[model samples]
Target: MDYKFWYTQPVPKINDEFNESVNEPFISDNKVEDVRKDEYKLPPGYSWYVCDVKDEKDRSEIYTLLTDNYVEDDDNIFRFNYSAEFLLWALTSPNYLKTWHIGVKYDASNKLIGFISAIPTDICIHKRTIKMAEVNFLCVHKTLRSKRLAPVLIKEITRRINLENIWQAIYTAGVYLPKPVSDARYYHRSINVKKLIEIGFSSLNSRLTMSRAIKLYRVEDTLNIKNMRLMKKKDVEGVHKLLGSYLEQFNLYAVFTKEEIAHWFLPIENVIYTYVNEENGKIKDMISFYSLPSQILGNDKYSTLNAAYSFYNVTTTATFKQLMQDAILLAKRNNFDVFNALEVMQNKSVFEDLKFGEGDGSLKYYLYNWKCASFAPAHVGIVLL
Candidate 1:
């Protein structure tokens, strides 16, 4: 289980203890001229392609590569099925560079076989603002696993970001890498209890029946906060201030601009949903979640499992638990089979009271070319989509 490749990377060692006072890049003062002027060489018969997510044809090519080869459960029961709309919304953030959406294609068939992406962002770590790339969706075709293509993809993406004068990165992985800035566990609350049990997403104990299970996870059909409503264009400034201030307390967090806030938080049907509570002509509280349905493998009756993942949330007027409960109610009303949240930020405070079951998997957050003392899950305020 040696991290042969990660060893050559700029991350700290697995057992290294970093001084909290030091919050800077491992390779400081990198210049664009120092980066390679060309993309990293791919295996023969494969070439790099800059995926344009805005184009349906190119979007589908990347989608097909991921839908079949992307993340899957430990038991291989489900695989992430990020929709075309979701990809468009996620990759097309304000001032996004299309070149960072890296893909590899077979020369003969002209088919996409590998993919990785990086999006520009500013992250505040230990009170130091650093411009970084949020890298994600690294995937290689199943047939090419023995070809060692993943390392090349990572090198290529790093080169692209460095060419843009970004020397730091933030990413998450389910596997244990060389080091992690913070580790967070996932929690799930069943909205459609019967479907979850039937699809093998959950199971009932010997003492409980289907009816009992359903009654246990049933959520209220109405909203609790009085003024809660979908976020609109006018609420962008209010949310910007609210979320920006709330995130400052965390040791690791994203520094979102007003334009980024509007692009990410504004309501997008079947992709992103944000709700806000406005009272006395000011926004008081806000909660949001994004849709990421999983493709059910080998299931005859069900083909997809609708899931709602908790996004950024802030509560100044209502209780944190109350706002989350309302989020569950809204997800249920929207026909989501399950609502998943990570034990990050203040989310752990309400998991037990909200009857959320702990998940088997954990997500490890990592910082590339940056080093700092690891912090608790509650100190992580950034949520990567």
Candidate 2:
């Protein structure tokens, strides 16, 4: 529970709460003119670089770095392999600042070794929406872990964001930090039970055999949901309204514009999958998930695990459980190996009923330069990759 340096930062303390029942900036006196004018000093032989995601070379470099050094499981069996297309979609959303895509590189060799990025967003907390940067993809090369560069990267990105007049940020991490606003558990549904068993991702109990497990997890070849179809260009406004109203009940949620909806929810081949139901001219409900494949390290027979991460969804016309069950069937039909969803929003209402087993992974959501009351998993409506 010890954070030797986080104590000196602007986030809330371990026991701090909204004693005054207020939502406001923690440091109210910061001025753009007084913000640090230069990048935070890094250890020698390292220099800062702006990651030009528009360039294919830069995208490939970042993809390679993350593919090799980003998040891995507890036992180190798999690593996130964020495809370049997904990175472009995520990093280049509406109003994203190119400067926030920061990186560090070795001066002599000019190889990128570190990265942390932030994208602009509006989050509704306790009925009030505040503009905040959604920070993510903080990574340091494996050989440079001892250099104490993560904080520098954080500070530099904070400085850049502050210069742009945004002072608050949101982020999530697998490990606990100084404090977290909410906690959520990871639940997984097996699309290919045999592959999961073979990959050591799941094991059979003494009372059950592989055949029974397969039978238990098999998805229907045809979904029963009528009017189920892929989300298209015409469904953007309908999806926006339906999703916005549905998310209003949550304590924490993202505000999305129609353009943002099109960017994030429209299916991009293997990158993102979105399905909607329309009766007459009204789009009542929709479901979506993004593809995030992880490299199956040390597994000779299989090299990639196709994972479908639950994205924004609204269930005005369909049961949440029915919508999710149909999603599982669609994912299975698309050849996805697993479908994963965090216990956020209305997910807990359907996870168990749909037979999603709770995984050991937990994600802690945190905010910077801001503090708010804590929340249960069901109140969290945001999912970060």
Candidate 3:
């Protein structure tokens, strides 16, 4: 697409049919691609405007530009600092467009600029029933940051979300200012330093990156889990029974009421889960998890399976080891390089046989209107939504 002037020529029009205001020009057609035509400067003196790609050719032009120039990050250590690959993972995931994504363009030259997208979830892996969206991949070219385009793009996206009557949006950011008024809290965890040193996971807390590290000693029982199996539809009732008192005691967010858990991890097309159920006559322990797959171009495949989102693992205090062991076996079969018993588990001493590593991802977990006491104090290395 050629760089064009928005000020002089009549600006592009929005779909006047549904749009009642002049300020919001809701263009109907979307040219989905990484538009980079205005590689340098735009027509002599031009500025910003939200416009639509005129036709198929216009859309094609955008794709060519994006595929040819969209920058991607090779590193994957930090989930908060999303690279282009992160954005693509969310965007391509089914239903991403339905829950989260925005079409943004530059004010000058009226070309596509920066974007931020969210990874949709039924409940966050830390175990919360709240409908949440993990907002991420906020990026704009260096030259465009000064123009206030990031906030504008964010506001436009937020406005759309509010109207849709969706729940809340979540994100991990370095700075708290500039974001909408949030009753904030830093995500916390209790790591076991002794267990960490035994395994290979680094202890980078004293160094440059984030100060957080594996906060708990989540051990797995290699013995009792020999009977691990896939979670079936029938396990809902058993799951509830197994987790009932523990969730009430901990104020933990796992074990979504039967109604929500089914659709919670959806599209069902992109995911698969394994449930480990132990029978001490009836179902006593259940661990459920799904892998969030991300294949980095030529790099090895990486998966972040919700390893410890188990609702209940103890029939008595002695039976907890089987839960951790079951999770380890499930992850091992799938070739999961890393498995985490995120947040606090009732007991970490169960899985001492396997390698354990410390991780740096932790956050100040928060909720908008919810009170802190409504939930139980968790013992895991985690931040619940």
Candidate 4:
């Protein structure tokens, strides 16, 4: 459990005491000029490339690398398959730096083999706002995993981010790292019970048959809440205000601008779906989910598993359970095989009534170079894609 790499970084130690009254960066005296003037040296046959996701060629290169080498289940039954449109939307957030979309490629063949991305974000911790980077999609080729390239990728991205004078970062991983601020378990509500059981993603209990299991997880086709429809550009201001006030109760949460809300929450055909409950030309609540499909390995009958991940949800008029149920119904109508949510931000309250089964895997949230008192999962208000 020795964190050789993390020991040199600025994160809090494994058993460090929580500072209940203080929240700030561990290293606050950094200047942009102090950062490394040059990129970290790669081994003989590798080079650094700034990925331009808007370019079709560059987008496809990254997509292929992730499709073959990104996260896979412990049993290797499925691999995360992020779509090209999703990548474009994720990397093109408001004021996102093109330089933060880092990549490493082999010199001889020029094949993209490594990647890690950071998007600028402002987060509120203990009522203090700090500009930070939300880092994600750190991956290295399967052939090059043991060569210690991940540390270099992390260091390079940090250097790039530091050049912009931002000093804090947030990330999540399924595996345990040096330290974590919060831990959240995943829960799933099945939409296609027969398909899930047949693909080994789920199993029927010993006492129940396939038909009975299907009946147990069935959801209605219609939504319960009235006037719940797709979010439009005009609703951006209302959503921003509602979501901002709703997230203020959490110990940690993202601070989204109106532009960010439009970019992130607006409905995109196959990537993001957001619906708002409107009455009297005012927004009362909002629900959203993003599509992330998994590549079903070695299954001739099924090649993909469409999953809907719960995004930010705000409820003011409707009950939390009712809004979540409507979200499930919407996802089911859209042909999602399963609906997944984390046990964070008031999500656990709906799990039992909505028939969501607890998942074995857990996601750990980490912060870089910042220290604060740890809080419960319910106190987490940020969701990193």
How displaced is residue 240 in candidate 1, in Å?
Answer: 0.4
- Runs in model 3 deviating more than 4 A are 1-150, 164-223, 240-245, 252-255, 265-272, 278-282, 292-318, 345-355, 369-385
Score candidate 3 by lDDT: 0.40
lDDT of 1 at 88: 92
- Against the reference, the lDDT scores of all candidates come to 0.92, 0.88, 0.40, 0.93
Name model 1 segments beyond 4 Å from true. none
Best first by lDDT, ranked = 4, 1, 2, 3
Tens-digit lDDT track of model 4 for 1-385? 7888989999988888776887888888899988888999999989999999999999999999999999998899999999999999999999999999999999999999999999999988888899999999999999987798999999999999999999999999999986888899999999999999889988977788898998898777777787889999999998998898999999889999999999999999879999998877788999999999999999989999999999999888879999999999999888999999999999999999999999988999999999888878999998889
| Candidate 2 TM-score over all chains jointly | 0.97
Steric overlap count per candidate: 0, 0, 24, 0
TM-score of each: 0.98, 0.97, 0.48, 0.99
* lDDT (Cα, tens digit) per residue for candidate 2, span 118-215: 99999887788988899999999998885679989988999999998888898999998978889998999988999999889989997779999999
Candidate 3, residues 1-385: lDDT per residue as tens digits?
A: 2212211112221211221122211222223232233322333433333222333443443343343333332343212222233233334443444434544554555665555455444433233455545565465654554565555555555444444444455454433221111222222112343322333233444542332344233434363555556666666566556555455444323334554434332213224354545576455555554443322333233322122222234534335554555555555555443455443445345435444433344323333222222222244222231
- Candidate 1 lDDT by residue in tens digits, 1-385: 6788989999998888898987888888788987889778876889999899999999999888989999998999999999988999999998899999998999999999999998999999999999999999999998888677899999999988988888999999999998999999999998999999999988988778999999999776777797789999999999999999999999999999999999999999999999999887688899899999999999999999999999998898778999999999888877899999999999999999999999998999999999899999999999998
The Cα error of candidate 4 at residue 104, in Å, is 0.5
